[PDB]
Write a protein that binds this ligand. Structure first.
Ligand SMILES: Nc1ncnc2c1ncn2[C@@H]1O[C@H](COP(=O)(O)O)[C@@H](O)[C@H]1O
Ligand SMILES: Nc1ncnc2c1ncn2[C@@H]1O[C@H](COP(=O)(O)O)[C@@H](O)[C@H]1O
Ligand SMILES: Nc1ncnc2c1ncn2[C@@H]1O[C@H](COP(=O)(O)O)[C@@H](O)[C@H]1O
Ligand SMILES: Nc1ncnc2c1ncn2[C@@H]1O[C@H](COP(=O)(O)O)[C@@H](O)[C@H]1O
Ligand SMILES: N/C(=N\CCC[C@H](N)C(=O)O)N[C@@H](CC(=O)O)C(=O)O
Ligand SMILES: N/C(=N\CCC[C@H](N)C(=O)O)N[C@@H](CC(=O)O)C(=O)O
Ligand SMILES: N/C(=N\CCC[C@H](N)C(=O)O)N[C@@H](CC(=O)O)C(=O)O
Ligand SMILES: N/C(=N\CCC[C@H](N)C(=O)O)N[C@@H](CC(=O)O)C(=O)O
Lengths: 386, 386, 386, 386
């Protein structure tokens, strides 16, 4: 039987490829997606073949990732529990999508992934798979094998000749996530030198740096006047924001499976894009549209976090967010300095701001009437209380 | 006829004090509240007497301000349009409340304030006034007078004996607001040296400073182990954060009155408290409670911003927020560095975090069933689309 | 100067026509719309010319009314304060839309309407007018003249040759509204004989009547197998629901301008449609989509009620509702009997219901896992309470 | 080993009692609760002993049911998916609460119930149990045993001495639920004579009946002037409403475990109470409070439906609803007639309604300013769209 494995190249997914051959005596098709992890995915592909894969596929999905997953999510202003910009979250749907497509192309029965039984990833992979191919068979080795502990897995690794070696990392174009190990104690600061995408604030330039991001109908299309594709644009902002230490988050979040866990994230480019968008929105979105939009963002955020990307409720909300984002066209000017992102300017060809309405269509006495009417129900209330 | 005026001691409320006397020929009781503007209010009380007030009152309302207004608001995680911590907004209700109490005490049928006809403050003072005493009369000189320029106001000031002297500011224990003049161009960065409460990040300490804030049942009670009263606590955090340049935001916001306005704010202490609270909340609040609470916060924020403090909607929402906030007990440890605030740790007596649930609360198979049930409707959907 | 008046042919708008001519020395162009009031609008168009209009326009807007206003609103499941199906609310935008178009075509700088200064209609008319043509001038005589009472208005009309003839009515294809007069006492049942669109349930047929309503992509397209245009369809359902006394509501509502008002409404066809729609949705909409949709309906309803039809917030929500409603294709079967409507059956081409899953893919063991995971956070909370 | 079983006295729970003793080599303590199912609970209690229970407990929980579960839910205006008044949903928590208490008193390590593995009840029972006593062991025979059909179940019972006897029913003081069998076809009207709690509208009195319900701080306290305890009050309204065939619902709902199912419900008393409460609320609740409250009700409804009664989200929302409900004091007057409930009058000690404001403080010109300000952002938008 054929099985398509989401293969990263790491120890665990390598142990999984061997485990699947041995346990299911199956023809394993390894799949590695280049989504900006900063690893030569071609090395993962050869290592998979070396580890026993009857086939290995490596694809550059950086553009699809940002264009079809990151951008739509950003248009919605999605933020989980106040700080998480969902770097790992929106990536999983993309990977499961291809796993399913590859399985259908290679006539494979099942697909497998290496997310553990304690997290959100397992849900994201599987909900995506079932939503796309309801008849698909899914295998989650972390839930199915008998290994108990790192020593056993390493022993098993060495036995099969698999290359063996504080926290665990998950990286892609949007961010790098860190959790586990020393990070499991919520009272303990992350260890110095852990971050990789972002330079330390204390080591960031002494001179602030200005950057401008242009948005067209809800999506960023240029940086400092240079038109850049979705992936190239995220990359560029990662470089600029990274040098300044921008986008570090440290939170204890609530997993979908029920328990809290301490996660640390660095999202330089995405963080710049979060504030740039709101800056352009401040001139281009209507007050009531904005207030409504912000009260829905958190719901869309948990949908992404839990793994309901290819789910009707998320696609429905997307219709709202996409409609609203269509008006977001303009430029945000931000000032980067030692870990912070400061909005310092913004402009738009169809700005709703009118200096003439605030400087010293507006008649001062209309305000009295507005106030009296707004006050009526409160006055009736007070009088009734006598 | 008696009129109680919200008197700050500035040129405008000074001009207003004279204007009221001439216009209404009423005795004016000047009221000056110390809410942390960093001004000697007795100086304003005496100047009010020199300007013609038949009675000048000055009260230290710092503790009432933080305890009965800033704290209840903070418990709700109130943030207007993404960044505004409502520094000016929660202050007006307090002032109006005293204006109405004093009018009742002095037998004054009317109150007056110096907010302009183009803004939010006018609504805040008046909705509060009418909500507390329905038949009170309110006079807003800015909406009633004839001055057609700043030049005319000063001439009137000099012609009357009032001392006369790029943007307008409003300061109190929570923040300092800056808007108008040079700030009316949303593409222009605020002028160098404008900020007064926070030190320029470029001139802030080279070594980060750690700070710990203790929360008890939703309100902050100690800083670095020192128990502090509400106003004392906010003051202490303003000093610590200010020294580091923390809490600066720049936005184009939507006034309740219809038009957009470019505002700049520095909220050092409040910004530290915002993040400290969420840090403690991450260990003490249930996932679902939190998610629901966060979707209501934006609504509570617009209520405070529009001026509906003493309104049934806000008091109802307050019951919800207060209920949830009651569990927020613990300590947040934050790191301050050149303009930025970083959560680096948190602990709590009744933390819901359990390392054993994440360390390598259910067994693997449980997750499989959870996923299958969660996936059911998506699979039926896919099948029907057959 | 020219003024386009929303003229219904009644006493008040006739008085208004005369009043406008003299007060503004203007040419008044009368506009009467047939939106299902059950009155020969041509008679109103002629009475206007007799009354002094320089031009009188009358249009059959029944189809545009149902297709472009009633249907989009019904797709959203809009219900104001638990019962009001907004019959008068969605009709005002339509009227004002034509007033502004006619004003433009005739070179008129202003439009006028006869809604009083204490209601919602004035807001709906003007918000629509201003939103479509920002510099249009609106004249609301009720807020400008000084008639001291009814007697005075009758004498004015008698003096102008206007024919002078216990509650006020507003009728159209969607419903008939009743309020004012004897209806002002919330404790008093409406008088017998008041209803006109519906038969007293006590006089309704002794046998129940079954009716089927087919929906296609969110809108009703057929009744009892007969395909019917929007307006013809609402009419047929009015006839059917009407004969049985269906659609009667009696509520005390909150007007946008601040005071409560007692209103009585009969919406036979719309009431059948409300339940028919939900019946088809019960087979075609996903659970999460439905739940989110229902939490937004109320907001949409107040938007309509207040008059924000041609408003970006409303249009944005409409994007969401339209997206969801595109899945609503199927047939609802209802049973009508003495005042009530009963859903007794429903079917759909792409129904999501599967008897497979309820009769004795699904494995009961999965339910245990689902339950354990959902319970984890509750159990942790319990252990911490200790 | 001791196991406390939710014992209804029926065939399946009797089979379960025998099954539990042998499978777990344990003694079973049967618990039967009278919650208004209209059965003699002492009969089930005696039968449990005859079936082998080591102890059988039967309690009258009618008052606790209505006072502590039904009323709190009603104050929230809870309605699931447009029509379900949650009759079975709110009863389960109460039952499980007692199972856990009895287990603790009897020193039993586990509890058991007879809900199936494909429904909602299992979740309600278990989430409740786990929330109250996290270490409790729950046994759900339907998800554990090996019976492969109804005939084998009958053979097992007949073999154990248990006596053996088109849809399934669940009845209590709030309603009677009907689902399964012939009701599984959503296009088929339910069978004649199926309803038990309500008289068919065709047979109901030709004379309408007026009923008055007095509310005090959110809860109903009297019917037609007669003060009644919670359970006696619900009983009374069931009798009155039942005679008139009030409260019948026919829906295809979404279960928490993922699939749709056709359910039929009769809730005579609860339906009168639903409309009675809203009638009193129309005079006692503020507009904004009401609108907010209605947007949260559906969320609370799904919580109850899913089984999250003793859950922090639900208790947090309850704080909101209870705050709001406290103003709900007054009397509702309804007209009952052949299946329908018509609100015909309402009054309250502190009614916020003022004939003052609608009859022909308020000055129409305030309305113009209100409208102008409300329209500003719309005019700005229009001008920009040019
Ligand atoms: N770039 C990728 N290509 C293919 N599969 C991936 C990729 N990144 C993650 N996965 C899968 O999802 C899991 C994610 O966990 P982790 O690598 O610890 O962050 C891995 O164990 C893989 O099975
Ligand atoms: N500390 C205070 N005491 C009394 N009235 C105040 C105080 N702060 C503000 N106000 C009132 O509210 C207005 C606020 O204006 P502004 O400072 O320009 O943003 C002043 O014109 C006063 O009438
Ligand atoms: N069919 C119609 N055509 C034109 N204007 C109308 C029509 N129906 C109502 N109006 C306008 O809106 C107001 C509605 O008032 P009313 O009937 O008292 O509820 C009238 O005073 C008219 O100015
Ligand atoms: N009055 C009651 N006393 C004790 N247990 C009950 C009672 N009503 C329901 N239950 C439990 O919940 C299930 C309810 O029945 P059903 O509606 O047939 O799925 C039974 O299998 C019992 O274990
Ligand atoms: N650490 C890791 N990746 C990423 C995550 C960031 C995060 N807290 C999230 O849920 O996105 N591996 C896990 C995370 C998880 O499922 O919670 C696993 O496979 O079990
Ligand atoms: N500048 C000033 N104070 C403060 C406020 C910050 C802000 N944008 C807010 O609404 O709180 N004066 C005004 C503000 C206003 O009313 O919007 C006035 O009286 O008109
Ligand atoms: N009675 C009338 N029409 C209709 C109304 C139904 C209702 N309560 C609504 O707001 O739609 N005329 C008024 C209503 C109002 O503006 O509230 C007026 O023009 O003054
Ligand atoms: N029919 C019955 N009881 C009640 C239900 C009304 C309903 N649709 C609801 O979920 O409350 N038995 C089931 C229902 C269920 O829990 O979904 C079972 O034990 O499996």
């Amino acid at each position: 039987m054929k099985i398509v494995l989401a293969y990263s190249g790491g120890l665990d997914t390598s142990i999984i490829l061997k485990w699947l051959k041995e346990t299911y005596r199956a023809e394993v098709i390894a799949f590695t997606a280049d989504i900006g992890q900063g690893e030569e995915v071609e090395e993962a592909r050869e290592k998979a073949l070396r580890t026993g894969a009857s086939k290995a596929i490596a694809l550059d999905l950086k553009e699809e990732f940002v264009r079809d997953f990151v951008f739509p999510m950003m248009r919605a202003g999605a933020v989980y529990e106040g700080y998480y910009l969902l770097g790992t979250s929106i990536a999983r749907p993309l990977i499961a999508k291809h796993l399913v497509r590859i399985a259908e192309e290679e006539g494979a029965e099942a697909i497998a992934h290496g997310a553990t039984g304690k997290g959100n990833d397992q849900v994201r992979f599987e909900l995506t798979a079932y939503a796309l191919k309801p008849d698909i068979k899914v295998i989650a080795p972390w839930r199915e094998w008998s290994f108990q502990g790192r020593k056993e897995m390493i022993a098993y690794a060495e036995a099969h000749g698999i290359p063996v070696p504080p926290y665990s990392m998950d990286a892609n174009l949007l961010h790098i996530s860190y959790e586990g190990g020393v990070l499991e104690d919520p009272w303990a600061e992350p260890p110095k030198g852990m971050f990789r995408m972002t330079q330390d604030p204390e080591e960031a330039p002494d001179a602030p740096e200005y950057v401008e991001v242009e948005f067209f109908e809800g999506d960023p299309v240029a940086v400092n006047g240079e038109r850049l594709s979705p992936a190239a644009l995220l990359q560029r902002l990662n470089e600029i924001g990274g040098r300044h230490g921008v986008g570090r988050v440290d939170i204890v979040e609530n997993r979908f499976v029920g328990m809290k866990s301490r996660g640390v994230y660095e999202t330089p480019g995405g963080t710049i894009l979060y504030h740039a968008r709101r800056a352009v929105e401040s001139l281009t979105l209507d007050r009531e549209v904005l207030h409504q939009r912000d009260m829905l963002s958190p719901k869309y955020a948990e949908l992404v976090y839990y793994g309901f990307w290819y789910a009707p409720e998320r696609e429905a909300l997307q219709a709202y967010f996409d409609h609203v984002a269509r008006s977001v066209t303009g430029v945000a000017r931000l000032k980067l300095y030692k870990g912070n992102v400061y909005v310092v300017g913004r402009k738009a060809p169809k700005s709703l701001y009118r200096q003439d309405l605030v400087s010293f269509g507006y008649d001062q006495k209309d305000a009295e009437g507005f106030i009296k009417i707004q006050a009526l129900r409160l006055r009736v209330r007070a009088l009734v209380e006598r």
